[PDB]
Design an enzyme around this catalytic site. Structure first.
Site, PDB file in Angstrom:
ATOM      1  N   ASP A   1       0.844  -1.226   0.000  1.00  0.00           N
ATOM      2  CA  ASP A   1       0.000   0.000   0.000  1.00  0.00           C
ATOM      3  C   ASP A   1       0.873   1.267   0.000  1.00  0.00           C
ATOM      4  O   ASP A   1       0.520   2.234   0.716  1.00  0.00           O
ATOM      5  CB  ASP A   1      -0.995  -0.042   1.160  1.00  0.00           C
ATOM      6  CG  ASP A   1      -2.313   0.653   0.849  1.00  0.00           C
ATOM      7  OD1 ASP A   1      -2.582   0.931  -0.354  1.00  0.00           O
ATOM      8  OD2 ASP A   1      -3.061   0.922   1.818  1.00  0.00           O
TER       9      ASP A   1
ATOM     10  N   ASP B   1       2.215   2.290   7.852  1.00  0.00           N
ATOM     11  CA  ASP B   1       1.076   1.356   7.611  1.00  0.00           C
ATOM     12  C   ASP B   1       1.571   0.047   6.973  1.00  0.00           C
ATOM     13  O   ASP B   1       1.491  -0.095   5.738  1.00  0.00           O
ATOM     14  CB  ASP B   1      -0.046   2.005   6.798  1.00  0.00           C
ATOM     15  CG  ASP B   1      -1.390   1.326   7.012  1.00  0.00           C
ATOM     16  OD1 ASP B   1      -1.422   0.244   7.684  1.00  0.00           O
ATOM     17  OD2 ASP B   1      -2.410   1.882   6.501  1.00  0.00           O
TER      18      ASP B   1
HETATM   19  C1  LIG Z   1      -0.273  21.310  11.579  1.00  0.00           C
HETATM   20  C2  LIG Z   1      -0.094  20.516  10.274  1.00  0.00           C
HETATM   21  C3  LIG Z   1       1.077  21.031   9.406  1.00  0.00           C
HETATM   22  O1  LIG Z   1      -1.382  20.602   9.594  1.00  0.00           O
HETATM   23  C4  LIG Z   1       0.268  19.060  10.618  1.00  0.00           C
HETATM   24  C5  LIG Z   1      -0.992  18.352  11.118  1.00  0.00           C
HETATM   25  N1  LIG Z   1      -0.853  16.913  11.054  1.00  0.00           N
HETATM   26  C6  LIG Z   1       0.044  16.182  11.742  1.00  0.00           C
HETATM   27  C7  LIG Z   1      -0.203  14.851  11.457  1.00  0.00           C
HETATM   28  C8  LIG Z   1       0.384  13.613  11.832  1.00  0.00           C
HETATM   29  C9  LIG Z   1      -0.131  12.455  11.355  1.00  0.00           C
HETATM   30  N2  LIG Z   1       0.408  11.183  11.603  1.00  0.00           N
HETATM   31  C10 LIG Z   1       1.306  10.757  12.486  1.00  0.00           C
HETATM   32  O2  LIG Z   1       1.786  11.461  13.341  1.00  0.00           O
HETATM   33  C11 LIG Z   1       1.655   9.314  12.415  1.00  0.00           C
HETATM   34  C12 LIG Z   1       2.887   8.875  12.883  1.00  0.00           C
HETATM   35  C13 LIG Z   1       3.197   7.530  12.820  1.00  0.00           C
HETATM   36  C14 LIG Z   1       2.248   6.665  12.314  1.00  0.00           C
HETATM   37  C15 LIG Z   1       1.029   7.149  11.865  1.00  0.00           C
HETATM   38  C16 LIG Z   1      -0.025   6.195  11.343  1.00  0.00           C
HETATM   39  F1  LIG Z   1       0.443   4.880  11.407  1.00  0.00           F
HETATM   40  F2  LIG Z   1      -1.086   6.298  12.248  1.00  0.00           F
HETATM   41  F3  LIG Z   1      -0.510   6.484  10.049  1.00  0.00           F
HETATM   42  N3  LIG Z   1       0.769   8.441  11.926  1.00  0.00           N
HETATM   43  C17 LIG Z   1      -1.221  12.500  10.471  1.00  0.00           C
HETATM   44  C18 LIG Z   1      -1.815  11.250   9.900  1.00  0.00           C
HETATM   45  C19 LIG Z   1      -1.000  10.760   8.694  1.00  0.00           C
HETATM   46  C20 LIG Z   1      -2.091  10.167  10.934  1.00  0.00           C
HETATM   47  O3  LIG Z   1      -3.124  11.620   9.511  1.00  0.00           O
HETATM   48  C21 LIG Z   1      -1.809  13.643  10.070  1.00  0.00           C
HETATM   49  C22 LIG Z   1      -1.350  14.862  10.534  1.00  0.00           C
HETATM   50  N4  LIG Z   1      -1.726  16.109  10.317  1.00  0.00           N
END
Ligand SMILES: CC(C)(O)CCn1cc2cc(NC(=O)c3cccc(C(F)(F)F)n3)c(C(C)(C)O)cc2n1
Length: 290
Positions: free
Chosen positions: A145, A163
């Site tokens: 994926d 993932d």
């Molecule tokens: C303010 C800003 C610049 O808008 C940024 C905001 N922001 C920050 C994020 C961190 C994220 N993810 C992770 O920290 C993360 C880390 C490790 C593993 C995983 C997973 F396995 F769950 F997919 N996710 C996401 C995910 C990918 C989970 O949606 C979205 C975000 N948005």
């Protein structure tokens, strides 16, 4: 490696009882990652992603167990990093190091008012994601994926593959009855149920096109709907890559975009045996920034 074994109540506590308001309005819900919703949290000054999983229980339990198995073996600066998990409570939860610039999908699309990635930054993300796929292939894993939604970006825009719920250990071509992946990214043979690292390579090429264009791989309200199709528009000299380069970049030059597009096109050959192995993709993406 091993990982902290968290009480379900601990992860409820650090995510404010899995608060469903967005991060942008001071909530804990960040987005969706596979078969689960993912919340921001704090354990002792460490910012974390808690992914709470919601398909059968035994299927969900398998992907949770697979993710832990893959993260046990595989540690690399271009892979996300598991801190712990929770089985005891109702919901299965995975706890990772936070990625402060979220997913490549979200940044390519400038979600929540983030500025467009420069060409210079895109080149590093590409080299980085390819270094990630390489480690997984070297350590005999097939992601299954690869897509921009699953390349996360840290504080320094370092590319981190994430993932591994569907990841298959593959010494080296099996076939399968349960066909899995995101259509818009999957290769021909993956969609017919073949399982081979060569599918990961095709999928990467789609992600190189996403990087080059800022277009998501599928869009129902766009022509063509499938970014893939644009390869065929270009090879049939109806359009050049120049007509498709993301306009939200001031710093992209013809040479390095064509260099990257050449990799994307090589990656995207319909005959899995004609595609380059991740090792050659690295060589070419590293060659592309002289
Ligand atoms: C303010 C800003 C610049 O808008 C940024 C905001 N922001 C920050 C994020 C961190 C994220 N993810 C992770 O920290 C993360 C880390 C490790 C593993 C995983 C997973 F396995 F769950 F997919 N996710 C996401 C995910 C990918 C989970 O949606 C979205 C975000 N948005």
């Amino acid at each position: 490696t091993r990982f902290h074994s968290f009480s379900f109540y601990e992860l409820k506590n650090v995510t404010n009882n899995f608060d469903e308001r967005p991060i942008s309005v001071g909530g804990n819900k960040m987005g969706e990652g596979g078969f689960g919703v993912v919340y921001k949290g704090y354990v002792n000054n460490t910012t974390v992603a808690v992914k709470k999983l919601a398909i059968t229980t035994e299927e969900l339990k398998q992907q949770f167990d697979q993710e832990i198995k893959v993260m046990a073996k595989c540690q690399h600066e271009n892979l996300v990093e598991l801190l712990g998990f929770s089985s005891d409570g109702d919901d299965l939860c995975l706890v990772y190091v936070y990625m402060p610039n979220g997913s490549l999908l979200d940044r390519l699309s400038c979600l929540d008012g983030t500025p467009p990635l420069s060409w210079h930054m895109r080149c590093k993300i590409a080299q980085g994601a390819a270094n990630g796929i390489n480690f997984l292939h070297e350590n005999h894993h097939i992601h299954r994926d690869i897509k921009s939604a699953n390349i996360l970006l840290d504080e320094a825009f370092t590319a981190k593959i994430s993932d591994f719920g569907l990841a298959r250990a593959s010494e080296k071509t099996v076939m399968t009855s349960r066909i899995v992946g995101t259509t818009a990214y999957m290769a021909p043979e993956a969609l017919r149920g073949e399982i081979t690292p060569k599918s990961d390579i095709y999928s990467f090429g789609v992600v190189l096109l996403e990087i080059i264009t800022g277009l998501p791989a599928v869009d129902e309200h766009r022509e063509p709907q499938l970014l893939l199709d644009i390869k065929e528009e270009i090879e049939d000299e109806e359009k050049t890559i120049e007509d498709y380069i993301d306009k939200k970049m001031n710093d992209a030059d013809s040479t390095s975009v064509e260099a990257m597009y050449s990799v994307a096109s090589q990656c995207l050959h319909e005959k899995k045996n004609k595609r380059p192995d991740i090792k050659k993709v690295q060589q070419l993406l590293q060659e592309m920034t002289a």
